[PDB]
């Protein structure tokens, strides 16, 4: 769906964004500046989201990707216990409605996280099966080996990666399919713009063909994007998704800007190869990123070197497909991989790194003002071991990205750069240039 | 003299640059990392200068401006005691000769500091007058009121600003003139490229007419540059100097990049006015700078904000006239005004700020590769309260300098920028762009 050419995403983990309504907080909520764990709650909430929408817009984003928000027992909310309600700590459906209306009044589209492979050990249907066993009307909605159901010391029922508090949904049951496909419809009826697929590789392609057809039938332009850490090609045959989370680009970029493992020749060859692997009409549905809730933080991956991290963002905003910033990374937050990357969002602007923030907005502005940067063909061209041009044509546009101590670039002599004008371009240490027309 | 269009200066205070030969050190020399005072010696030396010439060249400089080096009792060497010899801690004339030969083999010209208004209280002629009084053959080479000569509690003889250890030279004596004009010849015979004038406003224009004629008669192309904290116009009538130390530009620039007192409109109006005050054929003899041995350090003036200081250097390297860097400032040294700015040069490269260094080299490279940046007419044009273009034409070239959080510049709509090509230019927070052809 074409609108993805002009999209810029901000991923939010709602428990850690903003505690607007401390009446919703649990009894043993912790302080906002606390160290995040797998078990503690900071009381982030949906009103916190409405109240800080202006920061999102100011950064340059016009789409949100939200991690789970339905009723659940954990702080991450991948153990859903009622798919038809907002978690009681997040807000009510009225709070949710109020968030949607403010979003549509700014041109901000919403994506929620579809967790259909599994649910929580506290869900009504799993908790009944535990209680009514083979007499339960929901016995077959899961894959339970025998009775009594036992989790410790090993679950006697199918689960997501062997985790006991996540029992596995039986998708071969038409009843389970019905419920599942009603989730996708119920939230589409509430003003949703699309769905991200939690671990879609743990189910089957026939299911996800069913899911596209129920989704695209509410509207063609609803967007489906698959979680996938490896090759995207399975998901882009035109029968499942519109794109994937582009972890392949993530590893190529950080390899070059942070690790030092890959030089620019290696970067471009991989980016062109990936472009050749991806099928026509699907390049611009790709969801591009440098980190998420399942990774260490960008600045931490960069060892605190802020200018180096700005090279990451420059390459991020140049690529064909839609770029996503993870909450806090724009303002300089640090942190190791989960739970460390699910720190609380600081709101006293004096603690922010505003130069990193303003760096990122500059790259957003250039892309937004340049059509070719949104709908151009992508060609990566290496200039140097330490210097690469990402060229976009619809009339070229091009971002050049230097990780060295300084350089000069001869436009007129690079055939894909030649159709631009200004002969030589000058790049400072860890420099970047953005050119057009 | 035309060669000044292509010059870039590095000012060195030799006592604090590099101690190559610790045999020359005084008995109560201090450690190299010591806090500088008005009284202590670090043992910097001329061999230290030869041994680190490559750093100078690497920075992008091709002229040196050296503060006093003749025999003296202080660490600054403004109390000269024998004008015809290198201070015994600095080296010998052989060491000095060896420095000159290495300089000519790299295309590095030398300027020494002419201190003709006064000498030291330990000079042979003043020390004789103290001893032989009215029978001294040198009585009239100074302005001594009576005998016995007394300094404390107030000197009974003329001095530089009332400082007792600096007795004042009698320049109305033709003998003193002879000696003085032999200094200027003796060091020109040793391969010198020019002279900086210590406090030339404390003597007279007739003297400095004599001094030009003895200097320019050895060679036209020898350069004379006057110390002057105020208006340069007195010194540029074509009978005294080729230019001044451009403290007027210094205060205009730092006002804008560090103080916040002056906006870009105010900056440009002052730079154009100054350009209109300066006489034709003298613009390119101006010696431009952001600090010296008589000021606090650039980075200290900037309160440790390195990117802001890089705005200073960008404007410095764009101006008509020859830019000078003060030793250590390129590598990030900090310090208050004298003695604080006469810190020792660190040589373990791990302590250097190499991003500031590499920032400055980038501006040097652009100027060196662009003829118009060396011989172009200068016009300052304000774009914004926070954004200015320095335009140079011989075919324009232009550096744009932003102190704000980010901006875009419409080339085609600014008549002095219009003759360049690339329509809009993009500037990040504290950004800079350098354009040409
Ligand atoms: O219980 C294992 C694991 O579950 C959750 O991980 C999610 C992940 O965040 C999703 O993006 C996707 O990859 O599926 C996973 C399984 O639902 C928690 O986020 C994580 O903390 C926890 O260890
Ligand atoms: O004794 C006063 C003063 O003398 C020296 O100052 C020099 C100055 O550095 C020159 O650049 C120029 O302005 O003339 C002055 C007088 O010769 C010392 O450098 C300074 O420390 C001292 O206080």
Strands B70-72 and B194-197, how do they pair? unpaired
Give the DSSP letter of residue A168.
Answer: B
Same domain, B240 and B356: yes
Q: Determine the residue of B168, B294, B336 to mutate for testing ligand 2's pocket, defined as the one with the most ligand atoms within 8 A of the Cβ atom.
A: B294
Residues from B contacting A (CB-CB < 8 Å) are: 307, 354-355, 358-359, 361-362, 365-366, 369, 405-406, 408, 420-424, 426-432, 434-437
Give the chain B residue nearest A399 (alpha carbons). Answer: B426
Is residue A141 included in any domain, yes or no? yes
Strands A63-66 and A396-402, how do they pair? unpaired
Which residues touch B339 (CB under 8 Å, ≥6 apart)?
B36, B37, B38
Round to whole Å and give the CA distance between B196 and B245.
9
Cα A4 to chain centroid distance, Å, stands at 14
Cα A404 to chain centroid distance, Å, stands at 30
Residue B428: Cβ within 10 Å count: 25
Is residue A435 included in any domain, yes or no? no
Ligand 1: distance of its center to the CA of A293 in Å? Answer: 9
Is residue A423 included in any domain, yes or no? no
Residue A434 parent element (H or E): strand A432-436
**What's the reported resolution, in angstroms, to a tenth?**
2.1
Same domain, B244 and B111: yes
Round to whole Å and give the CA distance between B165 and B80.
10
Residue A288 parent element (H or E): strand A287-289
Distance from CA of A417 to the nearest CA of B (A): 13
Q: List the single residue in B358, B426, B430 with the smallest CB-CB distance to A429.
A: B358
Is residue A413 included in any domain, yes or no? no
With tokens 């350069």, the residue in question is B223
Hey, whose CA ends up nearest to atom 8 of ligand 1?
A294
CA distances from B111 to B62, B222, B325 (A): 11, 10, 14
With tokens 């009792």, the residue in question is B73
Q: How many CA atoms lie within 13 A of B248 on its CB side?
A: 21
Same domain, B18 and B128: no
With tokens 């989201």, the residue in question is A49
Two structure tokens written together for A294? 């399942």
With tokens 């991200």, the residue in question is A196
Same domain, B140 and B282: no
Give the DSSP letter of residue B67.
Answer: P
Cβ-defined contact of A422 to B424 (cutoff 8 Å): no
Strand order in the sheet with A109-114: A243-244, A223-226, A194-197, A109-114, A63-66, A9-12, A322-326, A287-289
Q: Determine the residue of B38, B69, B76, B338 to mutate for testing ligand 2's pocket, defined as the one with the most ligand atoms within 8 A of the Cβ atom.
A: B76
B135 is catalytic: no
CATH classification at residue B126: 3.90.400.10
Cis peptide before A78 (omega within 30 of 0): no
Way it was determined? X-ray
Residue B196 backbone phi and psi in degrees, to 5: -90, 140
Round to whole Å and give the CA distance between B102 and B285.
25
Residue A267 parent element (H or E): helix A264-277
Pocket (CB within 6 angstroms of ligand 1): A 76, 78, 160, 163, 166, 198-199, 227, 293-294, 338
Same domain, B72 and B215: yes
Same domain, B145 and B187: no
| CA atoms B135, B141, B146, B149: torsion sign | negative
Of the candidates B70, B63, B65, the residue with the CA atom closest to the CA atom of residue B186: B70
Same domain, B293 and B304: yes
Hey, whose CA ends up nearest to atom 9 of ligand 1?
A294
Is residue A384 included in any domain, yes or no? no
**Closest atom of ligand 1 to CA, residue A161:** 2
Distance from CA of A359 to the nearest CA of B (A): 6
Cis peptide before A159 (omega within 30 of 0): no
Round to whole Å and give the CA distance between A376 and A435.
14
Two structure tokens written together for B8? 């870039």
Round to whole Å and give the CA distance between A266 and B62.
39
Cα B372 to chain centroid distance, Å, stands at 24
Two structure tokens written together for B234? 């007195």
Same domain, B357 and B215: yes
Round to whole Å and give the CA distance between A240 and A206.
9
Is residue A113 included in any domain, yes or no? yes
Ligand nearest to the CA of B339: 2
Q: How many domains does chain A have?
A: 1
Is residue A125 included in any domain, yes or no? yes
Cβ-defined contact of B362 to A434 (cutoff 8 Å): no
Two structure tokens written together for A311? 């090279």
Cα B363 to chain centroid distance, Å, stands at 19
Round to whole Å and give the CA distance between B103 and A298.
47
Residue B29: Cβ within 10 Å count: 16
Same domain, B29 and B56: yes
Ligand 1: distance of its center to the CA of A77 in Å? Answer: 9
Same domain, B105 and B126: no
Strands B63-66 and B109-114, how do they pair? parallel
Distance from CA of A404 to the nearest CA of B (A): 10
CA distances from A363 to A59, A140, A406, A434 (A): 10, 51, 20, 8
Ligand 1: distance of its center to the CA of A78 in Å? Answer: 7
Residue B405: Cβ within 10 Å count: 18
Same domain, B27 and B156: no
3-state secondary structure of B302: coil
Q: List the single residue in A361, A421, A430 with the smallest CB-CB distance to B406.
A: A361
B198 is catalytic: yes
Ligand nearest to the CA of B119: 2
β-strand partners of A370: none
Q: Which residues of A touch B435 (CB under 8 A)?
A: 422
Is residue A106 included in any domain, yes or no? yes
Cis peptide before B148 (omega within 30 of 0): yes
Residue B401 parent element (H or E): strand B396-402
Give the DSSP letter of residue B330.
Answer: G
CATH classification at residue B49: 3.20.20.80
Strands A9-12 and A322-326, how do they pair? parallel
* CB B243, CB B282: distance < 8 Å: yes
Give the DSSP letter of residue A278.
Answer: S
Which of B104, B139, B168 is a domain's end point?
A: B168
Round to whole Å and give the CA distance between B424 and B176.
62
Cβ-defined contact of A366 to B430 (cutoff 8 Å): no
Q: Which residues of A touch B361 (CB under 8 A)?
A: 406
Residue B401 backbone phi and psi in degrees, to 5: -130, 110
Round to whole Å and give the CA distance between A123 and A74.
12
- Binding site per annotation, positions of B for Ca(2+): 19, 21, 25, 43, 45
Round to whole Å and give the CA distance between A239 and A213.
9
* CB A358, CB B428: distance < 8 Å: yes
Same domain, B335 and B283: yes
Ligand 2: distance of its center to the CA of B339 in Å? Answer: 11
* CB B249, CB B271: distance < 8 Å: yes
DSSP-derived secondary structure for A339-406: TTT-PPPP--TTSS-HHHHHHHHHHHHHHHH-HHHHHSEEEEEE-SSSEEEEEEE--EEEEEEE-SS-
Exposed, middle or buried by CB within 10 Å (0-12, 13-18, 19+), for A354?
middle
| CA atoms B53, B56, B57, B62: torsion sign | negative
* CB B324, CB B249: distance < 8 Å: no
Round to whole Å and give the CA distance between B437 and B435.
8
Q: Select which of A71, A227, A228, A242 is catalytic.
A: A227
Give me the helices (H) in B64-173, please: 93-106, 124-132
β-strand partners of A393: A377, A396
Residue A292's domain comprises 2-375
């Amino acid at each position: 769906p074409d609108w993805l050419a002009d999209a810029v995403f901000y991923q939010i983990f709602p428990e850690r964004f903003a505690n607007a309504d401390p009446s919703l907080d649990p009894q043993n909520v912790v302080p906002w500046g606390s160290t995040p764990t797998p078990d503690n709650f900071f009381g982030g909430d949906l009103q916190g989201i409405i109240d800080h929408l202006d920061h999102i817009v100011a950064l340059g984003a016009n789409a949100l990707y939200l991690t789970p928000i339905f009723e659940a027992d954990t702080n991450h909310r991948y153990d859903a216990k009622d798919y038809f309600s907002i978690d009681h700590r997040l807000g009510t459906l009225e709070t949710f409605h109020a968030l949607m209306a403010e979003c549509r009044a700014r041109g901000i589209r919403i994506v929620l996280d579809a967790v259909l492979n599994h649910c929580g050990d506290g869900h009504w249907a799993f908790a009944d099966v535990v209680e009514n066993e083979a007499d339960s009307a929901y016995v077959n909605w899961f894959s339970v080996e025998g009775f009594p159901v036992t989790a410790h010391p090993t679950p006697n029922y199918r689960t997501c990666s062997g985790c006991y508090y996540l029992p596995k949904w039986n998708a071969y049951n038409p009843e389970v399919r019905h419920h599942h496909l009603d989730v996708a419809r119920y939230w589409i009826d509430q003003g949703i713009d699309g769905w991200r697929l939690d671990v879609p590789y743990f189910i089957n392609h026939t299911f996800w063909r069913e899911f596209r057809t129920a989704v695209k039938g509410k509207s063609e332009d609803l967007y489906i994007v698959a979680e996938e850490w490896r090759s995207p090609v399975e998901w882009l045959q035109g029968d499942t998704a519109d794109g994937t989370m582009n972890y392949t680009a993530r590893d190529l970029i950080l390899g070059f800007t942070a690790d030092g493992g890959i030089d620019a020749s290696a970067l471009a060859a991989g980016l062109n190869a990936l472009h050749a692997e991806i099928p026509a009409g699907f390049h611009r549905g790709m969801l591009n990123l440098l980190g998420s809730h399942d990774t260490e933080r960008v600045l931490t991956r960069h060892a605190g070197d802020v200018e180096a991290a700005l090279l990451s963002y420059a390459l991020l905003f140049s690529l064909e497909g839609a770029p996503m910033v993870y909450y806090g990374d724009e303002v300089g937050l640090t942190g190791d991989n989960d739970p460390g990357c699910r720190g609380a969002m600081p709101w006293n602007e004096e603690s922010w790194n505003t130069r990193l923030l303003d760096g990122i907005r500059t790259f957003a502005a250039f892309r937004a003002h340049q059509p070719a940067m949104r709908r151009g063909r992508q060609t990566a061209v290496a200039l140097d071991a330490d210097t690469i041009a990402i060229v976009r044509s619809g009339e070229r546009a091009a971002v050049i990205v230097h990780r060295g101590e300084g350089t000069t670039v001869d436009t007129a002599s690079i055939p894909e750069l030649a159709p631009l004008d200004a002969d030589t371009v000058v790049l400072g240490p860890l420099g970047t240039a953005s050119l057009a027309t």
